[PDB]
Design a binder for these strands. Structure first.
Ligand SMILES: [Ca+2]
Ligand SMILES: [Ca+2]
Ligand SMILES: [Ca+2]
Ligand code: NA
Ligand code: NA
Lengths: 257, 256
DNA sequence: GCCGGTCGACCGG
DNA sequence: GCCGGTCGACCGG
């Protein structure tokens, strides 16, 4: 990680940073701590200025550093990596229409919140804000499906030393007429036991876990991670197939016969 | 519907309205046109003050005119309807610790945005916002599961005349800073063909469609709508179990 | 004390 | 038309 070494510099400037609350008055979903994510990034941009990039920010530069390139085919080859492309790309149309006049904007679908790149190594940073004023179910981490594919693309293309997926939990609470961070948590996806990783199918097939509680004792290799997770996914997919019928079918069959 | 009769009147007030954008970043999800639901409730309050209630505002009122009744037990009996309870009631410890000094607030998973009650009849209205500046996918209408549960309850209790679930789509487009409502659409769930409803399992098993495109020509009994929906629900469920395997199993089995 | 359901609203490598 | 993932972050009728 490119943040791990300065987690204390970050964690510190965070706790106690009174930030105005959303003018909307819902504090749910994106609006929840959206301003917080911005807060985190802004710091990196000033500390690790050379490695910090917003996912679209990276893209716009990537394309702009190669102006003599056009079309989707050519612009995709600029990733020099299938996996890393499947995680950061935009889509035929969006890619083909890119321009210095029609840049890329933040897309709700984007895999990573912030990108940290250096020495041909990428760190996909996804921050999760958590309202400490209450106790709720584990946040959405990432799509198990998009994770299963990323593993396939890793195994097939043999790319085990290219990127990392790390999370930064930002605990906040309501105080007065504005929000306030009260603590933080960091963890590395590829450092946790894959087999134990929880997949919430209904919840957009997302993996769910509080960063604060994520274990980090995986001693195996990266290749060993992918292959191990992909096995966990399938198993859970099968198990879910059955349970789905046992829960959304059986108890209702007495209304159609 | 207590809204329909004056749809044209609401549709005229909303068009033109504006809402300042948040942190000036990704106006999506709970942070998108969300604020427009606050304008629907407002105008609805001004023209139907005796029937407009935030689902929580309503519950706080119910309990407030029943000082004698305390405890989750009896407090639930205050709904006088299982189904509606499954759709409006709050948690156990929540209804227990309720006091005029600890009222209900906005819950993130509350079935409705607005509740229009009148003469023992309810209208669970769910407002939908949308940036028409782009051809986007259809929004989450409601949990297909929660719906199947609702119908099943409607048949166990014969409650085929008590509530209606309707939707109000409000389209907006960015204009400098604030977002300005440019259009509107209204539609009644229980009028659409319960069999042509699209269940997106990966998307919180939510029913998905754009209000402006929902068909309104069902010509059966409410009892029929339910029976049908459960037949359509149970079917799709089986089909999903099979689709999963061929999409999250076979293409990944080469890896072990 | 183990687990997963719901709301909001997004385009198509 | 039609089909369907994905990011965000929420507690118990
Ligand atoms: Ca995030
Ligand atoms: Ca709504
Ligand atoms: Ca299309
Ligand atoms: Na994520
Ligand atoms: Na809904």
């Amino acid at each position: 990680s490119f943040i791990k070494p300065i987690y204390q510099d970050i964690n510190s400037i965070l706790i106690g940073q009174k930030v105005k609350r959303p003018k909307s008055g819902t504090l749910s979903g994106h609006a929840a701590g959206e301003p917080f994510e911005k807060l985190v990034y802004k710091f990196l941009k000033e500390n690790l200025s050379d490695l910090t990039f917003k996912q679209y920010e990276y893209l716009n530069d990537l394309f702009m550093k190669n102006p003599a390139i056009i079309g989707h085919e050519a612009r995709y080859k600029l990733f020099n990596s299938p996996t890393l492309l499947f995680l950061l790309s935009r889509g035929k149309a969006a890619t083909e229409n890119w321009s210095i006049e029609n840049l890329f904007e933040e897309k709700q679908n984007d895999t990573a919140d912030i990108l940290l790149v250096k020495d041909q190594f990428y760190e996909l940073l996804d921050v999760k804000t958590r309202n400490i004023s209450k106790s709720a179910q584990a946040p959405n981490i990432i799509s198990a499906y998009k994770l299963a594919q990323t593993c396939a693309k890793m195994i097939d293309n043999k790319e085990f030393d290219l990127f990392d997926i790390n999370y930064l939990e930002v605990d906040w609470e309501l105080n007065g007429e504005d929000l306030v961070c009260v603590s933080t948590s960091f963890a590395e996806l590829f450092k946790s036991e894959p087999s134990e990783l929880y997949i919430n199918w209904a919840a957009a097939m997302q993996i769910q876990f509080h960063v604060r509680d994520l274990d980090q004792g995986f001693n195996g290799t990266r290749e060993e991670w992918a292959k191990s997770y992909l096995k966990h996914f399938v198993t859970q997919a099968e198990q879910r197939a059955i349970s789905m019928i046992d829960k959304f079918v059986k108890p209702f069959k007495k209304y159609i016969l």
